[PDB]
Design an enzyme around this catalytic site. Structure first.
Site, PDB file in Angstrom:
ATOM      1  CG  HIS A   1      -1.532   1.333   1.510  1.00  0.00           C
ATOM      2  ND1 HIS A   1      -1.142   2.097   2.590  1.00  0.00           N
ATOM      3  CD2 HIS A   1      -2.484   2.048   0.868  1.00  0.00           C
ATOM      4  CE1 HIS A   1      -1.833   3.223   2.602  1.00  0.00           C
ATOM      5  NE2 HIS A   1      -2.655   3.218   1.568  1.00  0.00           N
ATOM      6  CD  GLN A   2       4.189   2.210   4.476  1.00  0.00           C
ATOM      7  OE1 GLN A   2       5.280   1.688   4.253  1.00  0.00           O
ATOM      8  NE2 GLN A   2       3.811   2.590   5.692  1.00  0.00           N
TER       9      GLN A   2
END
Lengths: 298, 187
Positions: B29-30
């Protein structure tokens, strides 16, 4: 006859101090002296205990001291003197076969990678371990490892590593006293939640004095993770050196007693019937003698 | 969308694989927040629907250049011990396509009551009489658990794989790899 002693208490070698944590910024770890320690806070969700970094920090400061004692084969309380003499002869024979070479190297690995940072290493993009050798209150010899290069699965070599290996081996043999201040530095992120060892407000996090901490026995169980000589399947890495090779995460116990690879059958083969096991099995046996135990019959 | 990469969690004597799935999901996600784009898919190859289990592998579907930039991104540091992966190889040709969706839930009645304070300025008893405590939604779907830097509360992200269709649809992907209309192959 040469039976096993009824009491066979063994003290723990490689005594770990109670590991704290603290918060700070990367590239200020050279000035990591007055870093403010994180605190266990009660938060209402039912109220639970949470520990996390502040806003102006991204690095953990887990600090503990490890003492290497020596006299690994000597029991603290042995019922039988003949069994104690035979076991001391067997451990001394192991020392002449190898002078705590591989065990001290793997323990220097578990110091070198932050396996004592159990859940504070998974989300970290940069992990650093600093080990100072305190002798008469002064830093005799410093080390600054990197847990990113030193993997948690393979068992490699490095020059400063081998220096730490000879230091731990000299501590385990009994030729000196080794006291190591180990300070970890993991870039877990800005204000991210950390994982101290948990006490049993449904769930509480253990601390010592206005500052959250990790338990000594967690650091000890992390340091014991050198055992790769179990009948490994499914690509599992090293496990902790335990009697009957058990792990709580998988819910299963390697080195099953139905096989002849658990620690107690290897002891009764090694020191009673003179059935000397393999080099790896006796490495595992001496590691289990280093960790201590309550061994003996009933 | 033609290439896929399988990341399998190597088993750990310290952690059950659910936290490894959560950490890998937060790291990807990052990476997807930092990189940008919406042609990056997410699947679960051994997703068993018997006990809503995630499995032990994860599948990423994307293009060649996007996956090369994803592997060139330094998000993968610190995860090499717990995960192992091959190469961004192409998907097989006769593969049916299914969608992946994030199904949230209104599990807290008090959160919606505090919302209705900010929309109609009603009282607490009006909120309790209008919305009872039985409005909480129990969702029997596989899920991962995550925390955010923007919002410090710990949130659960439910993942549901759609019915197996016969073709793909042109749609984007979210930053979690979930589809806002996209589809991923199944094999």
């Amino acid at each position: 006859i040469l039976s096993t002693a009824s009491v066979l208490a063994f003290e723990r070698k490689l005594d770990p101090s109670d590991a704290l944590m603290s918060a700070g910024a990367w590239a200020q770890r050279d000035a990591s002296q007055e870093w403010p320690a994180v605190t266990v806070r009660e938060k209402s969700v039912q109220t639970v205990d949470v520990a996390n970094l502040p806003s102006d920090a991204d690095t953990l400061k887990v600090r503990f001291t490890l003492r290497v004692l020596g006299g690994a084969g000597t029991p603290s309380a042995c019922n039988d003197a003949a069994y104690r003499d035979k076991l001391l002869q067997t451990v001394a024979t192991y020392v002449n076969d190898q002078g705590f070479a591989e065990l001290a190297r793997r323990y220097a690995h578990n110091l070198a990678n932050a396996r004592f940072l159990w859940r504070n290493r998974v989300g970290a993009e940069a992990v650093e371990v600093r080990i100072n050798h305190i002798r008469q209150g002064e830093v005799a010899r410093a080390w600054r490892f990197d847990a990113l290069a030193i993997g948690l699965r393979d068992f490699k070599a490095d020059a400063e590593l081998d220096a730490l290996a000879e230091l731990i081996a000299s501590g385990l043999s009994g030729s000196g006293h080794v006291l190591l201040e180990v300070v970890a530095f993991a870039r877990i992120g800005d204000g991210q939640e950390v994982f101290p060892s948990q006490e049993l407000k449904s769930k509480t996090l253990y601390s010592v004095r206005d500052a959250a901490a990790i338990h000594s026995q967690k650091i000890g169980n992390a340091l014991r993770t050198i055992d790769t000589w179990y009948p490994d399947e499914d690509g599992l890495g090293p496990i902790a050196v335990e009697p009957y090779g058990s792990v709580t995460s998988q819910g299963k116990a390697y080195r099953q007693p139905k096989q002849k690879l658990d620690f107690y059958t290897l002891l009764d083969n090694w020191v009673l019937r003179d059935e000397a096991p393999a080099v790896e099995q006796q490495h595992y046996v001496i590691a289990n003698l280093i960790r201590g135990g309550v061994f003996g019959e009933a | 969308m033609d290439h896929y990469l399988d990341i399998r969690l190597r088993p750990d004597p310290e952690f059950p694989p659910a936290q490894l799935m959560s950490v890998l999901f937060g790291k990807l996600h990052q990476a997807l927040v930092a990189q940008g784009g919406d042609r990056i898919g997410v699947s679960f190859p051994d997703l068993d629907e018997s006990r809503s289990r995630l499995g032990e592998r994860l599948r990423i579907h994307a293009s060649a250049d996007d996956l090369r930039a994803l592997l060139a991104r330094p998000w993968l540091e610190g995860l090499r011990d717990h995960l192992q992966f091959g190469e961004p190889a192409v998907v097989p040709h006769p593969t049916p396509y299914r969608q992946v969706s994030r199904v949230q839930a209104k599990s807290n009645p008090e959160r919606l009551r505090r919302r209705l304070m900010r929309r109609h300025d009603l009282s607490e008893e009006e909120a309790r009489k209008r919305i009872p405590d039985t409005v909480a939604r129990a969702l029997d779907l596989p899920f991962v658990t995550l925390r955010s830097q923007s919002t410090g509360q710990h949130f659960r992200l439910f993942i549901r794989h759609g019915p197996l269709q016969v073709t793909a649809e042109e749609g984007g992907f979210t930053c979690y790899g979930l589809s806002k209309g996209g589809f991923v192959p199944w094999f």
